[PDB]
Design a protein around this ligand. Sequence first.
Ligand SMILES: CC(=O)N[C@@H](C)C(=O)N[C@H](CCC(=O)N[C@@H](CCC[C@@H](N)C(=O)O)C(=O)O)C(=O)O
Ligand code: NA
Ligand code: NA
Ligand SMILES: [Zn+2]
Length: 414
Amino acid sequence: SMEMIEKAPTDLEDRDKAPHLLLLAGIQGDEPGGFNATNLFLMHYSVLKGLVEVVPVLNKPSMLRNHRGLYGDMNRKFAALDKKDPEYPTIQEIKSLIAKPNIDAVLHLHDGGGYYRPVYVDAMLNPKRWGNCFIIDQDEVKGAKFPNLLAFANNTIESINAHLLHPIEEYHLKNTRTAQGDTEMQKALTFYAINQKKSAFANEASKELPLASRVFYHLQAIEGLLNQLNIPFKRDFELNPSSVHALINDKSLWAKISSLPKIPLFNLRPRLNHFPLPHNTKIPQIPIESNAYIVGLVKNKQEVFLKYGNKLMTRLSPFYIEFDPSLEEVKMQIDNKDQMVKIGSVVEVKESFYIHAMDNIRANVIGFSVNEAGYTIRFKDFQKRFSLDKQERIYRIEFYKNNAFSGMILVKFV
Ligand SMILES: CC(=O)N[C@@H](C)C(=O)N[C@H](CCC(=O)N[C@@H](CCC[C@@H](N)C(=O)O)C(=O)O)C(=O)O
Ligand code: NA
Ligand code: NA
Ligand SMILES: [Zn+2]
């Protein structure tokens, strides 16, 4: 289930004041440098004129299973393709984005093995390898707004190479001269783009690099190309591997599953038991929201995994149950003060809480034992192993009516 997100200026008229870039990653589901780079771009950059359309992950089902491509190589499906291929509709969506008049340029991100060199050096460094290179299908595309691919590529490479972490990481140009007999690249995404008279580029980050360094180079390539296109932008951080690592591992990231409260992505216990999910609903249909763009759910054996790209954030052991939406709010005393707490919220507790009883609603405070409404509850009353978090501060309160699920509230002890 890929999606397209627009990064555009605040003033809608400014969209036509600079070029339009389509930024794509994750066509292989095991190349996280690309789709963590698109994720950070969406979360932390602003486009001040023009437009950058972003598909953060093209092959989302494969990403969720940490798999190169569950239905084969999606980047060989842009030429001949049987209408019955399982990804045929996804390919049509991708082609439609690429071919729209409102796109000038396309940048396709990949992670690749070893380090490309134009001459054979050794097993890791040679023309067959793909890491740390910037790729075009040909030097010029007649009829594009910016036909000079080579000039753009050379300048983008120069920009990246001004920021090398180690000298082995030096970027080189790879021109696949696709039209001149490269039957594999003839089936891939950027050649389709060139044939729609878009300027098209791919960036490769080496798989020999740690994720933060891969993402660093992908972001250098994006910035280099935006600079060549004269698409002005800002970002809310300094571009170095330390900062990239911090932003990937951002403790403010959350996931909201169905009508449940937001849970933090990071520092969840590895397994969460008896976790309510709506029954008779296929997992890909369960709404899941996040401030990140590469989060989802996927079935694995008898568990449901919460994924952040290729990272496993927790294993849900599901409790499939009817989600009754009639209960909107619950009266709770929080640190002596009565308040109406909405179902699906998180309430911070310094001292204590007390849930007011409701006639046909039963409350289970998970980790508290004696209906558990009508008890004054403090941190020392909790069995800490029932916490959602490694920090042992976040606990679930679940409401039932009374063979159906009426909702959840989280308490966080602060
Ligand atoms: C399909 C394949 O050859 N896989 C292995 C045996 C390999 O040689 N290299 C893999 C994959 C290389 C790769 O997938 N490289 C991309 C480049 C596409 C560039 C451009 N034409 C585009 O559409 O973005 C592609 O072959 O699809 C690696 O580096 O881990
Ligand atoms: Na070198
Ligand atoms: Na399904
Ligand atoms: Zn790839």
